[PDB]
């Protein structure tokens, strides 16, 4: 059978890649940072507690001004907060309450959200009338929306439970490109700082690097044992971190094409739900199923801090563009700002 | 100046806050339900008797609002999107009892739902559907349940069982055996957090909307008794 001819040949292509990466792995990140001094103990306190959501929060996203942020809760609400004064700026009621992701446009004029409705809805924040209404409804995913991120006012990338990712032209509402490498549900995506690439993690325990303008999968990363739930780019765009249900976080490098560091502990037996780096990339913050957030020294793989305020599962966390504050959403319906 | 903005922002926040209080009363009054089941289980028939990624059904029993959600355009892998329904009042699980092997597959799905970390406090209203089809398969006698379930040979109808009038004891023994296969999973990890409410149903039973209401009332009662450490 020719199906075995192609299944035994791909095995050799997996052995060739395994040895091509093995040769590049001359040293490990741990020994190169065996001499750098640790960050110490990181103590962050809750500065703001954003209340107003009725049900569990699933996603949040900072604005580019590092002050405004949007949060999505499964009671069917998008709330735009002023993190300084804790004042709500907008409260957008959603058509479908089973929202799983939200996004802030870099211009600050649009927000996006989506979930089990299989639709990415775009809202106009700055209308001439002064209201917030739906600008576009992007349909074309056959599975639930897991993540969405704006490239600009007219382009947004979405990841879906139907195992694909897609790039949308917002004004026309049509998929410009489609990314069909994964075999499991895609759970999260992260745009490179130059917005020319993006990485996505799926439920096949793998992550993939995509060319936005070309539409191809450049690199595929493995190493995790279970579903990848979270993914985030390193500040320089040359690396990214993934959090999985196998209770570990891992760091990958694009140019080395392999995992550099694993952030784990023997007492941690719960999955990671969200990851984000600090402004310099020295800190890797991760939310966990056990209601806590762990601050990881991304260079030494040592745990440096813990944010312990949340009553329930931590769903999301974001770092401001100026690195001043960290937000955390949780299933307890509260958002906490930590400095 | 800066002071004028803080005034105008404080006005917008209070207007949003009054709307949120109104939303809180509407949200806390509706009871959300997840409807699960195979393609041949008959749940789509129970839906109409009472492509988007999810479908909604809003019905009312005794002036109580119920919001039933049916999964539409999703893949058969549920381990991710099923976590969204951890806060529903109950999960309505529909099983085709006459499908003895869809029945073992339904037993396996019930086991993973029952033992899921995020669904541990969610009760399950279990509909053992297609009871009329099960009667025709046992009365005919062409296919023995003992083939796919060899423990049916040594199984006797329990004494607490209440067979319907005009029912062949072979049918009563068959349908109560299937119920016990599910109850063996339910009573192994109950622990008082959640409970399974099994019902022998038919896809056209007009009393199905009442079984959900009566089970949801029992679920909320056990939730209140739990907040006072009474039960």
């Amino acid at each position: 059978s020719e199906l075995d001819q192609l299944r035994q040949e791909a095995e050799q292509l997996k052995n060739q890649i395994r040895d091509a990466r093995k040769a590049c792995a001359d040293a490990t990140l741990s020994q190169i940072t065996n001499n750098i001094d640790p960050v110490g103990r990181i103590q962050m306190r809750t500065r703001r507690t954003l209340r107003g959501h009725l049900a569990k929060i699933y996603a949040m996203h900072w604005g580019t001004d590092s002050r405004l942020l949007v949060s999505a809760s499964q009671d069917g609400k998008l709330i735009i907060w002023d993190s300084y004064t804790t004042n709500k700026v907008h409260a957008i009621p959603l058509r479908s309450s089973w929202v799983m992701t939200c996004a802030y446009a870099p211009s600050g004029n649009y927000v996006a959200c989506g979930g089990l409705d299989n639709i990415c809805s775009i809202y106009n924040l700055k209308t001439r009338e002064g209201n917030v209404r739906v600008s576009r409804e992007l349909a074309g995913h056959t599975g639930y929306l897991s993540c969405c991120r704006f490239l600009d006012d007219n382009q947004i990338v979405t990841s879906s439970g139907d195992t694909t990712c897609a790039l949308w032209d917002i004004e026309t509402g049509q998929q410009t490109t489609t990314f069909t490498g994964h075999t499991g549900d895609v759970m999260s995506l992260s745009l490179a700082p130059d917005t020319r690439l993006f990485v996505s993690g799926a439920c096949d325990a793998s992550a993939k690097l995509w060319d936005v303008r070309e539409g191809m999968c450049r690199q595929t990363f493995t190493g995790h044992e279970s579903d990848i739930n979270a993914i985030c780019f390193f500040p320089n765009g040359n690396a990214f971190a993934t959090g999985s249900d196998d209770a570990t976080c891992r760091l990958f490098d694009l140019r080395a094409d392999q995992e550099l560091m694993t952030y784990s502990h023997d007492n941690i037996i719960c999955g990671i739900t969200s990851v984000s780096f600090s402004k310099s990339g020295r800190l890797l913050l991760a939310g966990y199923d056990d209601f806590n957030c762990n601050v990881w020294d991304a260079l030494k793989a040592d745990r440096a801090g813990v944010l312990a305020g949340h009553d329930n599962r931590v769903s999301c966390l974001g770092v401001t563009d100026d690195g001043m504050a960290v937000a955390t959403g949780s299933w307890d319906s509260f958002l906490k700002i930590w400095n | 100046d800066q002071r004028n903005e803080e005034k105008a922002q404080r006005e917008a926040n209070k207007k949003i806050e009054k709307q949120l209080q109104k939303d809180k009363q509407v949200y806390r009054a509706t009871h959300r339900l997840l409807l699960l089941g195979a393609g041949e289980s008959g749940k789509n028939t129970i839906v109409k008797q009472m492509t988007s990624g999810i479908f909604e059904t809003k019905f009312q029993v005794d002036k109580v609002n119920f919001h039933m959600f049916d999964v539409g355009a999703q893949r058969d892998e549920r381990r991710k999107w099923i976590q969204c329904f951890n806060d529903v009042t109950a999960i309505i699980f529909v099983v085709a009892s006459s499908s003895y092997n869809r029945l073992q597959a339904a037993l396996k799905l019930f086991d993973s739902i029952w033992n899921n970390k995020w669904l541990r406090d969610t009760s399950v209203i279990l509909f053992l559907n297609k009871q009329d089809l099960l009667a025709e398969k046992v009365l005919a006698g062409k296919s023995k349940i003992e083939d796919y379930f060899p423990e049916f040979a040594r199984y006797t109808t329990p004494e607490d069982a209440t067979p319907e009038p005009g029912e062949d004891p072979r049918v009563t023994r068959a349908k109560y055996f299937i119920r016990d296969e599910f109850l063996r999973i339910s009573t192994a990890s109950g622990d008082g957090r959640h409970y399974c409410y099994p019902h022998f149903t038919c896809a056209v039973d007009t009393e199905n909307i009442r079984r959900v209401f009566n089970d949801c009332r029992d679920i909320i009662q056990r939730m209140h008794l739990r907040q006072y450490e009474l039960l």
Partner: nanobody
Amino acid sequence: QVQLQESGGGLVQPGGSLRLSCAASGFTFSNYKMNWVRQAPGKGLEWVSDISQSGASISYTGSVKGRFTISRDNAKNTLYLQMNSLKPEDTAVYYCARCPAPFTRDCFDVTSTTYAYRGQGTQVTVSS
């Protein structure tokens, strides 16, 4: 890289014996529940048997009780399905399926059409 490689199988007579083996790689074997699933010709995937992390709790589909015995050697990272007194209806491709998450009591999606943590399979043929 999670990989499951099923061995054994082939042609056998009714009442014969076949011992299926599943070599695991790329994950801590002991932290995971393991399953056996099969796909008969022209039919869907069916769960056959599973075994807990340590090997104490064991379950079977009724049609193979008294005939098939599942076991695991965590030190050897291997799953086994000893199949005694085979019947012609036991002809199928047998897949060694891993459970998606570690340290869990639930085990979702192991019989899905596109499940990721499943091997390619091995063929078992029981005929005259």
